[PDB]
Amino acid sequence: GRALRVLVDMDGVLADVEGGLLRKFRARFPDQPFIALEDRRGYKACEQYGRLRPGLSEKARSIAESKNFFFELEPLPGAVEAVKEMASLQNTDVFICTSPHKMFKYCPYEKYAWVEKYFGPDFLEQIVLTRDKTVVSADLLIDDRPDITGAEPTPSWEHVLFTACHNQHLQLQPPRRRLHSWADDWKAILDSKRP
Amino acid sequence: GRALRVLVDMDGVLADVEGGLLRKFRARFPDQPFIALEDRRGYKACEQYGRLRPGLSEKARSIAESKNFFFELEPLPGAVEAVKEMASLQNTDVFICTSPHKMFKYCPYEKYAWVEKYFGPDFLEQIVLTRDKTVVSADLLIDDRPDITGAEPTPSWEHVLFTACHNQHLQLQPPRRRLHSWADDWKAILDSKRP
């Protein structure tokens, strides 16, 4: 039968982008103010730094643009184990669908290398790099961004919001769904989209 | 109204991969035999080099894996001008949909940089990097590979074959279509998929 196709974005779902940004920002700019994760709001971290103090958006971006930022990101709790199990389920195809952002120098390569490091070479085959997820056909999309953007007004996938510091204060209105973490019942969400 | 969505793969359609491989192979390995473009058959160039002489698949691959291989590729005749015009047509969205191959170090980055060089920064937004084009939804796909591969058995796009040295000897059976070059009537092909 037809496989359930699930898209999972790496950022803030598999790899701890927010923790990495905060940790490296503080080490490189120890005499500047920063944004504790609990105070993060909205997916655009650099823009919030810019509101904190003029110039900090640029410094935060320079952190994310630095060599090894993406590669040295820590996996989120239970992320690698859940996605490995998910991909091993019958009638389930998992693709990692994630953005190069506007940082083409190191980000694409390190994202490939990160996935290979934690998931193996085989899994590299399942990666789709795109700014626009709406042109990718699938049954489900799990990512940390509450807003959909891209060329297709109504995507084929149901969008499921993975909890992150910047989105956790949003109280989603049904039937919009939230996955609180990888300890949460993700199998139930997948099963709901099966025949 | 709904925009016509056209996927165009860079390799052998916008950027002259075959000419670049041959030119750099010959300069780096001047005392080895090579495959003239007229003798190329099948999209897998390294495999054909391997059949020519044991070890040459590895050398050909080392050419494509080298820094600046992708970035220094020459645009194919009329390619940049056609795609710029195509993207400027009303009710037409163009995405560049292309593979990282298994060469993650320089290939993704240089493909982004190549597109920016010839098409501008804006156009980077329209790039989709994937091994599997069948999970990308669209009306048309133009690439140089005669065979479809990927998870979706029947893709949403019509596949149009762009002529390249390795595929030109294939006589396509209707209704399969071929675009002979960018001087050919590509507008007619697009128009045929419009309402």
Please report, for the domain that includes residue B23, its CATH number.
1.10.40.40
- Domain end marker among A53, A71, A89: A71
Provide φ and ψ at A95, rounded to 5°. Answer: -115, 135
CA distance A103 to A146: 22
Is B112 an 8 Å CB contact of chain A? yes
Total Cβ atoms within 10 A of residue B1: 7
Provide φ and ψ at B6, rounded to 5°. Answer: -120, 125
Smallest Cα–Cα separation from B14: which of B89, B88, B97, B91?
Answer: B97
Active site residue A143: no
Is B2 an 8 Å CB contact of chain A? no
What is the 8-class DSSP label of residue A136? Answer: B
Residues B92, B138, single domain; the answer is yes
Is A91 an 8 Å CB contact of chain B? no
Q: Which of B111, B123, B135 would best serve as a mutation to test chain A binding (most A beta carbons within 10 A)?
A: B135
Per the CB < 8 A criterion, the answer to whether A172 and A161 are in contact is yes
Per the CB < 8 A criterion, the answer to whether A171 and A159 are in contact is no
Smallest Cα–Cα separation from B116: which of B83, B158, B71, B86?
Answer: B71
- Domain end marker among B44, B71, B98: B71
Residues A85, A42, single domain; the answer is no
Total Cβ atoms within 10 A of residue B192: 10
Determination technique used: X-ray
- Asked if B109 lies within 8 A of A113 by C-beta distance, the reply is no
- Active-site residues of B: which are they? 9, 11
Residues B65, B89, single domain; the answer is no
User: Which residues on adjacent β-strands are paired with residue B94?
Assistant: B6
Residues B91, B32, single domain; the answer is no
Segments of chain B assigned E as strands: 4-8, 92-98, 127-130, 140-143, 158-162, 177-179
Distance from CA of A159 to the nearest CA of B (A): 17
Helix ranges (DSSP H) in A41-185: 45-52, 56-65, 79-88, 107-119
Residues B139, B57, single domain; the answer is no
Which residues have CB under 8 Å from B131's CB, separation 6+?
A: A125, A127, B99, B100, B150
Q: Exposed/middle/buried for A158, CB within 10 Å: 0-12, 13-18, 19+?
A: middle
What residue numbers bound the domain in which A56 lies? 17-71
What CATH number is attached to the domain comprising B141? 3.40.50.1000
